[PDB]
Design an enzyme around this catalytic site. Structure first.
Site, PDB file in Angstrom:
ATOM      1  N   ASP D  70      15.688   1.385  10.240  1.00  0.00           N
ATOM      2  CA  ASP D  70      14.370   0.987  10.758  1.00  0.00           C
ATOM      3  C   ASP D  70      13.065   0.849   9.634  1.00  0.00           C
ATOM      4  O   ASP D  70      12.356   0.059   9.778  1.00  0.00           O
ATOM      5  CB  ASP D  70      13.700   1.772  11.807  1.00  0.00           C
ATOM      6  CG  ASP D  70      15.014   1.936  13.133  1.00  0.00           C
ATOM      7  OD1 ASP D  70      15.390   0.926  13.279  1.00  0.00           O
ATOM      8  OD2 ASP D  70      15.016   2.872  13.511  1.00  0.00           O
ATOM      9  N   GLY D 217      10.264  10.504  29.820  1.00  0.00           N
ATOM     10  CA  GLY D 217      10.377   9.458  30.764  1.00  0.00           C
ATOM     11  C   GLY D 217      11.190   8.236  31.150  1.00  0.00           C
ATOM     12  O   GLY D 217      11.535   7.605  29.969  1.00  0.00           O
ATOM     13  N   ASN D 266      14.986   9.196  23.953  1.00  0.00           N
ATOM     14  CA  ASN D 266      15.416   7.607  23.756  1.00  0.00           C
ATOM     15  C   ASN D 266      14.681   6.949  24.574  1.00  0.00           C
ATOM     16  O   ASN D 266      13.945   7.276  25.468  1.00  0.00           O
ATOM     17  CB  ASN D 266      16.852   7.624  24.165  1.00  0.00           C
ATOM     18  CG  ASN D 266      17.644   6.399  23.424  1.00  0.00           C
ATOM     19  OD1 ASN D 266      17.039   5.722  22.785  1.00  0.00           O
ATOM     20  ND2 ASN D 266      18.999   6.544  23.550  1.00  0.00           N
ATOM     21  N   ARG D 290      20.816  -1.770  25.912  1.00  0.00           N
ATOM     22  CA  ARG D 290      20.173  -2.792  25.894  1.00  0.00           C
ATOM     23  C   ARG D 290      20.998  -3.867  26.124  1.00  0.00           C
ATOM     24  O   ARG D 290      21.294  -4.868  25.260  1.00  0.00           O
ATOM     25  CB  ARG D 290      19.425  -2.946  24.538  1.00  0.00           C
ATOM     26  CG  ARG D 290      18.660  -1.597  24.243  1.00  0.00           C
ATOM     27  CD  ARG D 290      18.109  -1.236  22.749  1.00  0.00           C
ATOM     28  NE  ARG D 290      17.456  -0.092  22.628  1.00  0.00           N
ATOM     29  CZ  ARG D 290      17.054   0.225  21.408  1.00  0.00           C
ATOM     30  NH1 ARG D 290      17.004  -0.444  20.440  1.00  0.00           N
ATOM     31  NH2 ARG D 290      16.116   1.209  21.605  1.00  0.00           N
ATOM     32  N   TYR D 324      14.028  -4.912  22.678  1.00  0.00           N
ATOM     33  CA  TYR D 324      12.634  -4.868  23.057  1.00  0.00           C
ATOM     34  C   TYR D 324      12.020  -5.930  23.814  1.00  0.00           C
ATOM     35  O   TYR D 324      12.384  -7.066  23.668  1.00  0.00           O
ATOM     36  CB  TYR D 324      11.702  -4.697  21.569  1.00  0.00           C
ATOM     37  CG  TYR D 324      11.912  -3.370  20.888  1.00  0.00           C
ATOM     38  CD1 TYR D 324      12.897  -2.239  21.328  1.00  0.00           C
ATOM     39  CD2 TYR D 324      10.964  -2.824  19.902  1.00  0.00           C
ATOM     40  CE1 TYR D 324      12.980  -1.030  20.710  1.00  0.00           C
ATOM     41  CE2 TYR D 324      11.020  -1.735  19.262  1.00  0.00           C
ATOM     42  CZ  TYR D 324      12.181  -0.662  19.754  1.00  0.00           C
ATOM     43  OH  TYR D 324      11.903   0.558  19.416  1.00  0.00           O
TER      44      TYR D 324
HETATM   45  C1  LIG Z   1       8.688   3.530  13.500  1.00  0.00           C
HETATM   46  C2  LIG Z   1       9.989   3.571  13.924  1.00  0.00           C
HETATM   47  O1  LIG Z   1      10.815   4.171  13.131  1.00  0.00           O
HETATM   48  N1  LIG Z   1      10.467   2.852  14.959  1.00  0.00           N
HETATM   49  C3  LIG Z   1      11.817   2.897  15.454  1.00  0.00           C
HETATM   50  C4  LIG Z   1      11.693   3.455  16.987  1.00  0.00           C
HETATM   51  C5  LIG Z   1      11.608   5.004  16.887  1.00  0.00           C
HETATM   52  O2  LIG Z   1      12.579   5.404  16.131  1.00  0.00           O
HETATM   53  C6  LIG Z   1      11.766   5.483  18.131  1.00  0.00           C
HETATM   54  O3  LIG Z   1      10.499   4.933  18.705  1.00  0.00           O
HETATM   55  C7  LIG Z   1      11.465   7.109  18.368  1.00  0.00           C
HETATM   56  O4  LIG Z   1      10.421   7.586  17.836  1.00  0.00           O
HETATM   57  O5  LIG Z   1      13.114   2.910  17.487  1.00  0.00           O
HETATM   58  C8  LIG Z   1      13.712   1.734  17.326  1.00  0.00           C
HETATM   59  C9  LIG Z   1      14.643   1.385  18.301  1.00  0.00           C
HETATM   60  O6  LIG Z   1      15.251   0.269  18.140  1.00  0.00           O
HETATM   61  O7  LIG Z   1      14.991   2.345  19.068  1.00  0.00           O
HETATM   62  C10 LIG Z   1      13.156   0.881  16.653  1.00  0.00           C
HETATM   63  C11 LIG Z   1      11.992   1.208  15.709  1.00  0.00           C
HETATM   64  O8  LIG Z   1      12.098   0.504  14.318  1.00  0.00           O
HETATM   65 CA   LIG Z   2      12.465   7.378  27.690  1.00  0.00          CA
END
Ligand SMILES: CC(=O)N[C@H]1[C@H]([C@H](O)[C@H](O)CO)OC(C(=O)O)=C[C@@H]1O
Ligand SMILES: [Ca+2]
Ligand SMILES: *[C@@H]1O[C@H](CO)[C@@H](O[C@@H]2O[C@H](CO)[C@@H](O[C@@H]3O[C@H](CO[C@H]4O[C@H](CO)[C@@H](O)[C@H](O)[C@@H]4O)[C@@H](O)[C@H](O[C@H]4O[C@H](CO)[C@@H](O)[C@H](O)[C@@H]4O[C@H]4O[C@H](CO)[C@@H](O)[C@H](O)[C@@H]4O[C@H]4O[C@H](CO)[C@@H](O)[C@H](O)[C@@H]4O)[C@@H]3O)[C@H](O)[C@H]2NC(C)=O)[C@H](O)[C@H]1NC(C)=O
Ligand SMILES: *[C@@H]1O[C@H](CO)[C@@H](O[C@@H]2O[C@H](CO)[C@@H](O[C@@H]3O[C@H](CO[C@H]4O[C@H](CO)[C@@H](O)[C@H](O)[C@@H]4O)[C@@H](O)[C@H](O[C@H]4O[C@H](CO)[C@@H](O)[C@H](O)[C@@H]4O[C@H]4O[C@H](CO)[C@@H](O)[C@H](O)[C@@H]4O[C@H]4O[C@H](CO)[C@@H](O)[C@H](O)[C@@H]4O)[C@@H]3O)[C@H](O)[C@H]2NC(C)=O)[C@H](O)[C@H]1NC(C)=O
Ligand SMILES: *[C@@H]1O[C@H](CO)[C@@H](O[C@@H]2O[C@H](CO)[C@@H](O[C@@H]3O[C@H](CO[C@H]4O[C@H](CO)[C@@H](O)[C@H](O)[C@@H]4O)[C@@H](O)[C@H](O[C@H]4O[C@H](CO)[C@@H](O)[C@H](O)[C@@H]4O[C@H]4O[C@H](CO)[C@@H](O)[C@H](O)[C@@H]4O[C@H]4O[C@H](CO)[C@@H](O)[C@H](O)[C@@H]4O)[C@@H]3O)[C@H](O)[C@H]2NC(C)=O)[C@H](O)[C@H]1NC(C)=O
Ligand SMILES: *[C@@H]1O[C@H](CO)[C@@H](O[C@@H]2O[C@H](CO)[C@@H](O[C@@H]3O[C@H](CO[C@H]4O[C@H](CO)[C@@H](O)[C@H](O)[C@@H]4O)[C@@H](O)[C@H](O[C@H]4O[C@H](CO)[C@@H](O)[C@H](O)[C@@H]4O[C@H]4O[C@H](CO)[C@@H](O)[C@H](O)[C@@H]4O[C@H]4O[C@H](CO)[C@@H](O)[C@H](O)[C@@H]4O)[C@@H]3O)[C@H](O)[C@H]2NC(C)=O)[C@H](O)[C@H]1NC(C)=O
Ligand SMILES: *[C@@H]1O[C@H](CO)[C@@H](O[C@@H]2O[C@H](CO)[C@@H](O)[C@H](O)[C@H]2NC(C)=O)[C@H](O)[C@H]1NC(C)=O
Ligand SMILES: *[C@@H]1O[C@H](CO)[C@@H](O[C@@H]2O[C@H](CO)[C@@H](O)[C@H](O)[C@H]2NC(C)=O)[C@H](O)[C@H]1NC(C)=O
Ligand SMILES: CC(=O)N[C@H]1[C@H]([C@H](O)[C@H](O)CO)OC(C(=O)O)=C[C@@H]1O
Ligand SMILES: CC(=O)N[C@H]1[C@H]([C@H](O)[C@H](O)CO)OC(C(=O)O)=C[C@@H]1O
Ligand SMILES: CC(=O)N[C@H]1[C@H]([C@H](O)[C@H](O)CO)OC(C(=O)O)=C[C@@H]1O
Ligand SMILES: *[C@@H]1O[C@H](CO)[C@@H](O)[C@H](O)[C@H]1NC(C)=O
Ligand SMILES: [Ca+2]
Ligand SMILES: [Ca+2]
Ligand SMILES: [Ca+2]
Ligand SMILES: [Ca+2]
Lengths: 388, 388, 388, 388
Positions: D70, D217, D266, D290, D324
């Site tokens: 990420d 949640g 998650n 997903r 997403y």
């Molecule tokens: C800033 C960052 O790293 N955001 C990442 C986000 C994050 O890890 C999660 O929201 C826990 O904080 O997760 C995911 C994901 O596909 O699940 C992608 C994003 O790139």
């Molecule tokens: Ca959740």
């Protein structure tokens, strides 16, 4: 600025000159050219562009395999600069779908794309690049439209749609849009028995559409629209010079109000310019396949059931592949008359050339000249062997 | 805005500085660069661009095989940003054809492309990016034009065309266009015996064209046009410094009104700036092939049959390939005089480099400086071996 | 509109934030990215763009072999959208040559490119995208300039050039241009003993240039220009925090008017912001090679011969390759002060990474923040092994 | 012109029509398409564009290996024309970083990108394409933001950020920007226990954000912002129709002020339109991954803890990968109401498809229709096997 009005008549067509050619398949052999089909041309007040239904993959791309199919979720109406090829980098998406039409009303452009499964399709009408209106399938059988430009007059842009069977009576509707909104729609009337893929043009406040009778006619159905009264009529080109494909051999007398028989459930999008003695018909040379292309001057073809050619011009040799053809004109050109133009889709690949797994095309287009110009043939130009 | 008028004289040419170079062949070895030939440069009031005749395929593409040929249905006049290469993605098609010219009149641009079979070609004159006029072949033998920019004065843009034999007397015509329409045309007059591919420039309401006598002359024919009276004259550059290619060795006295003999039925497009003592001639270094390129200051070359060089500048070494060359100037630049410019087509591939199956080129161009600048040579730069 | 005037002082630099990064080498591994070096950044009133000297070939192209060389006929100054890579398709050629500078005066941009053989180079000054002035080499030994943006004030844009030896006294000149024309030029004065590749910025009607003494200095020469009086002075950064490369280890006392010794005939283009206590110096981390990069706050570095760091920020880890660095600012931003910015050239390939035959780079750039931001390191990111 | 004001209410959502689809992965198999993730859509007064976080490499490029991660120094927020794919040649970089948001206030656009190591990140707020404000991490644990467009009202554009743990209480802040400057910021208040990746939209001077509670949640937290008072509240969607992923099976009664338990640490970015009976919720079909995507009309979902669906529309089949999803609307469209729109990120590659070493996505987006349109499913369309 102001809405364009069809105030001029057609220029006298004494021959056809080369207007545009993108050589897409040739170039696409070694560059990022999108696979397309169902192309056309359409003008804005300041520019004329090529349009087509992308297949959402390049020709050399592995996803080109299977592009012979007409409707998928990966198709979209795209436009690109005149005579350039449709590349991943220069193609502008007008809307998502597998059947379309588009036209500029003088102020801005309206684009329509239909998408969906066969029994649950819907059209979405975009205006000024924003979605404005949606129309759900009414016959639950492949809602479909022109595959070439629509025409506007004082803001009113009529469009012909068909929903239902391709091999029996269907429900054709003429919608009159203004700024992407529906002013009115009519069911098809007149003597045309089946309508699909109308090619239209406008002159002197009247819109003429040469379409295709897929069910039974080898002669072409014609819809004439009055965009002010928002009414229309329909009949067939009377002429014995048959212009659909496949078709039987030309007779000596045609049919004015019924499909000319001999070939059922098939056809190709085509067009014509019906203007008394200044009448020209386009058609494939072959009566069996989408091969070759020629323009024939057939005075009074629309109303004379014995009319035959008085002049002609070959566009594509019978030894080269053709495909769909349609009409467009630059309504924003200088001068006192509208110069008739048309394009021919040059299909390459499946089903005729099955050594490759894709189906695509390139575009060639001409416009009329008041001169009697020498003729050349304009093939796609690509060598299939190179793609093997 | 308003039509441009040739109100300035030429700046004093004391040397030549580098203006543009696209390194097209080098770059095209690994990117989508179109195969071209017959290039040139031309300016609009707000931008100067490279122009050329595309072959409708990339250099690395399999369709590059066979591009040594001059006329096909896959060629088109294209333009692209100054010094960029002509790529599939940045090339703008001006018109379809295999012989062309183009020039901006101050308000908008006129582009002309000729297409057709050898015995049935036709030119179509585009203005403001729309087709306006068409001219059918008059001698039924490869109607052809300048291959470099035309020049306009108060809306009038003269263009030289030739139709007929390349190895005997032909029918050359000077057309005077205004807004793409024909105001008048004349047959060639004067003492020039054969005219092809005129390179023109304008100054102080006069247009000078240095062309090529393919039939018999190793000296260059020159056409001087009065764009107001719409009349012209013709003769040859008197100078013994011969500038066509192939050519015999330079004599001590040239010919003012007849082709200088020694080489028949061949030649190369070239140019010159004939301005009394401020006269400069371009030519290949080799007398046998399109090899090398140099600029020679030959005071009064046009009228002095014994004129020889007083200064010079090498542009391309005799150990590098050259090709066509022509004139253009930015008529919309600041200052009190017009800065003479030219380009040299750097041909690569066939027939000189036959290990590859294609023929293309890159472009190098210079403009004059009132300084006495140091010189560099400017080769294409590509290694053919890389393409094998 | 109107010529820009350096009416603001610098914003307080409390840290550096990420401004742009093109990841050119990473992306270029599989796309048409041009090989470059000597990059920089420069703003127009409505846009800021990346600039560099193209090598006239893509990185993956076979012609990338040999790009370690600095001067060829295939180089050109190109610019492209901020943070995009320099691709064949998006790079705009500003001029042809192997040494350059460029700056917008508020109305339009001036670009300068030098080309030629070592003993016969010449600079051509373009303004509003047209060639206007030419300057022939005066010392016949690699006429060369800044390799980063120049700065303008009320139409006057000073530029520093050097011609002559790189390992002994040379002839440095400061030219004051206005609309591409020469208003005046001076020989270098002051105590700087050798000048090359000046990085400049302007504030409160004064232009400060941090250059490089290739001959003897490990401290940097500094030229301060008054663009109204069109006069200047020169000295060296007094600070013991040495900023050229290669260099000896930092002493406790520097030199204000002589090169700090220890390393001869070598160096790297660099920069600094000299603004009393708001003074920041950039430099490679390694004292031996173009490795790593950091910003050090050294209050009064210009005038304090014992000044040492009071704050710092790492830009590139010493385990990553760096290269040239220079200054630029967006003079057309909102607010009351000019935000100091800089770029670092991230060189990849030869000579440090000789498994590949090319030399190129990517760009990273930062601007100042009044906040005390956390720091990250910004490497090129490409894996050389992938190119093997 | 003038700052946009949220003066309209939402149009009645009776179904969803296709708005855009770029087929990026399909096309990218054989063209220069950048690897991305975290995409979204956002409109300017004259154009709507796709946005996403580039990984600084093409999909076919060797550097695509490892893109499942990420945060790297090679990511950047890029935008490109609606429905085109994000290519190296058409992608415009808005800023550098690995978490972002962007929105147009009617006059110009504000874009925000966060970069840095996990414990030292910082956000930089760009306005009118220039950096204006910087905010250093306050909790030293992955400062992060929306990953979809923000919304403005009279120049005020609120943005939600979170810094701290993803699996325990964190520090969420609502910043109110105007012209890129901070007017005010608040700590999160209300009953939402954890906030991340808010999807927002505005109507009748109120901004609604549907976010994600990563910690505990399975129902979604909702933040409602008053952009005039610059105040807000927070709660959870009361409905038993759970919309995060992974999640437990739907209960018969939800939770209004606490996370609905069953799944910890998650989740996936998602959205909803909460407008009384005109309420629609988006969610993956699978409760485990997903996979798939559907829209469910759940009247009064926000406030009714027993609300269940009354209508629905499948967007992506459960046999296809999703990802997403977020909200956006064209606030500059014609008409009396705002047309709700959303996009779904179609993730391909790792971790679900591990035969390839990369992770990327394509985009599909829909907008509402007042018609009851037939539905189609919209998968990515690419065949992973082709990439092997
Ligand atoms: C800033 C960052 O790293 N955001 C990442 C986000 C994050 O890890 C999660 O929201 C826990 O904080 O997760 C995911 C994901 O596909 O699940 C992608 C994003 O790139
Ligand atoms: Ca959740
Ligand atoms: C340089 O350029 C110029 C400009 O282009 C060239 O001149 C042109 O030359 C063309 C070719 O000769 C010519 O085109 C033809 O025109 C004919 C009409 O003119 C003649 O008749 C009129 C009327 O009496 C006279 O006034 C005139 O003087 C001429 O005598 C058309 O009839 C021609 O079309 C027919 O033939 C072609 C084959 O050539 C078919 O493809 C075409 O479909 C037409 O014939 C079919 O259809 C008719 C009508 O039903 C049938 O009767 C006929 O049997 C054919 O039917 C079979 O084939 C069709 C199609 O496959 C199938 O469906 C059916 O079932 C049957 O199997 C043709 O159009 C241009 O008009 C002429 N232009 C000008 C300005 O002069 C010049 O040659 C060039 N120079 C050089 C050196 O090359
Ligand atoms: C740094 O840069 C500067 C600036 O460029 C360099 O200085 C330049 O140097 C150039 C090379 O010397 C020079 O170019 C030559 O100029 C000559 C004219 O000047 C001389 O004569 C005049 C007149 O009397 C004097 O005033 C002046 O002071 C000089 O003495 C030209 O005559 C030269 O061209 C001829 O030679 C070249 C070969 O060098 C041929 O390629 C060219 O075609 C000319 O010669 C052919 O043609 C003539 C005319 O018919 C014949 O008489 C002759 O025999 C040749 O004919 C054969 O070859 C041709 C072509 O292949 C073929 O068709 C024919 O049949 C025969 O086989 C040349 O142009 C620049 O003027 C000069 N510029 C300046 C401002 O000084 C400086 O050197 C550089 N510094 C370094 C360190 O490199
Ligand atoms: C989150 O982000 C924040 C924000 O970035 C992080 O905080 C930053 O942390 C940085 C690293 O500590 C820090 O940078 C250093 O600042 C020092 C100055 O501050 C200190 O001294 C002042 C003055 O007394 C005090 O006020 C202050 O409180 C501090 O105590 C600099 O001195 C540092 O630079 C020197 O060290 C680095 C190695 O770290 C060298 O690369 C650098 O060149 C400097 O040292 C060389 O040069 C000096 C001067 O000549 C020599 O004396 C010295 O011996 C070194 O010389 C050798 O090396 C050079 C280079 O190779 C060679 O040429 C020479 O010949 C010798 O071989 C450094 O700049 C930031 O200021 C600080 N920022 C802030 C706002 O706090 C925070 O850590 C991050 N959080 C996490 C969790 O990571
Ligand atoms: C042509 O196009 C038209 C237009 O799209 C097509 O018509 C549409 O057809 C859709 C499919 O039938 C239909 O969608 C459904 O609508 C239902 C609501 O309508 C019905 O109930 C209302 C209320 O009483 C009535 O008024 C109405 O008349 C209907 O009877 C929804 O309830 C449907 O969603 C539920 O089912 C799908 C599976 O189909 C699930 O994916 C979805 O999640 C919903 O069910 C889950 O969630 C609920 C709520 O908690 C649970 O109760 C239920 O058990 C399911 O829970 C499991 O699954 C979820 C998801 O995996 C999981 O999280 C949970 O833990 C459990 O495991 C559905 O939305 C359209 O509304 C309808 N549109 C129109 C205008 O008519 C037409 O068919 C097409 N023609 C052809 C020929 O194809
Ligand atoms: C070139 O010359 C013509 C005069 O021959 C200029 O034309 C006049 O322009 C003005 C301003 O548009 C008009 O009022 C005259 O009637 C124009 N034409 C003629 C034919 O009289 C033209 O403006 C000149 N071009 C420029 C750039 O000054
Ligand atoms: C920069 O300073 C000069 C003054 O030196 C400004 O120039 C004046 O601009 C106005 C408006 O165009 C004219 O009326 C004056 O004659 C201009 N010049 C001079 C040399 O007096 C210029 O406007 C300033 N730039 C800006 C952006 O304000
Ligand atoms: C909407 C649609 O599917 N149109 C298809 C059309 C249609 O099948 C026929 O008109 C019978 O209805 O046929 C063809 C064709 O090349 O023949 C292509 C179109 O893609
Ligand atoms: C219209 C056309 O064919 N022009 C060709 C021209 C012509 O053959 C010659 O001028 C004799 O007429 O020759 C050449 C050439 O490189 O020599 C290229 C042109 O493409
Ligand atoms: C005009 C020119 O050649 N500049 C070169 C410059 C020069 O050699 C040195 O400044 C001694 O003069 O060196 C370097 C370099 O990476 O070190 C790159 C430049 O391309
Ligand atoms: C590059 O050029 C050098 C020097 O000519 C040659 O030896 C070398 O093999 C070349 N390498 C490649 C990959 O072309
Ligand atoms: Ca039929
Ligand atoms: Ca490629
Ligand atoms: Ca000759
Ligand atoms: Ca040094």
């Amino acid at each position: 600025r102001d809405f364009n009005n069809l105030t001029k008549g057609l220029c006298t067509i004494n021959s056809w000159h080369i207007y545009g050619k993108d050589n897409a398949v040739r170039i696409g052999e070694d560059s990022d050219v999108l696979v397309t089909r169902e192309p056309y041309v359409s003008c804005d007040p300041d520019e004329c562009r090529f349009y087509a239904l992308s297949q959402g993959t390049t020709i050399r791309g592995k996803h080109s395999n299977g592009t012979i199919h007409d409707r998928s979720q990966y198709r979209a109406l795209i436009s690109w600069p005149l005579s350039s090829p449709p590349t991943v980098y220069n193609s502008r998406v007008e809307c998502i779908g597998w059947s379309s039409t588009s036209c500029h009303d003088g102020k801005t452009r309206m684009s329509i794309c239909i998408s969906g499964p066969n029994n649950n399709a819907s059209a979405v009408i975009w205006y000024n690049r924003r979605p404005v209106t949606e129309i759900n399938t009414w016959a639950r059988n492949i809602l479909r439209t022109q595959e070439s430009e629509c025409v506007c007059h004082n803001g009113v842009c009529p469009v012909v749609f068909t929903d239902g069977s391709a091999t029996g009576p269907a429900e054709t509707r003429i919608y009159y849009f203004k700024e992407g909104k529906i002013l009115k729609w009519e069911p098809l009337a007149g003597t045309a028995k089946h309508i699909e893929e109308c090619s239209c043009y406008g002159e002197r406040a009247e819109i003429t559409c040469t379409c295709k009778d897929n069910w039974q006619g080898s002669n072409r159905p014609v819809i004439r629209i009055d965009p002010v009264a928002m009414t229309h009529t329909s009949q067939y080109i009377c002429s014995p010079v048959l212009t659909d494909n496949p078709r039987p051999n030309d007779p000596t007398v045609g049919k004015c109000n019924d499909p000319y028989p001999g070939n059922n459930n098939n056809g190709v999008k085509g067009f014509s310019y019906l203007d008394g003695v200044n009448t020209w018909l386009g058609r494939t040379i072959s009566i069996a396949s989408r091969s070759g292309y020629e323009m024939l001057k057939v005075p009074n073809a629309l109303t004379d059931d014995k009319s035959k050619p008085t002049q002609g011009q070959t566009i594509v040799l019978n030894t080269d592949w053709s495909g769909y053809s349609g009409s467009f004109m630059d309504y924003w050109a200088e001068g006192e008359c509208y110069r008739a133009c048309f394009y021919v889709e040059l299909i390459r690949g499946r089903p005729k050339e099955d050594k490759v797994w894709w189906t695509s095309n390139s575009i060639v287009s001409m416009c009329s000249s008041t001169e009697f110009l020498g003729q050349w043939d304009w093939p796609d130009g690509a060598k299939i062997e190179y793609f093997l």
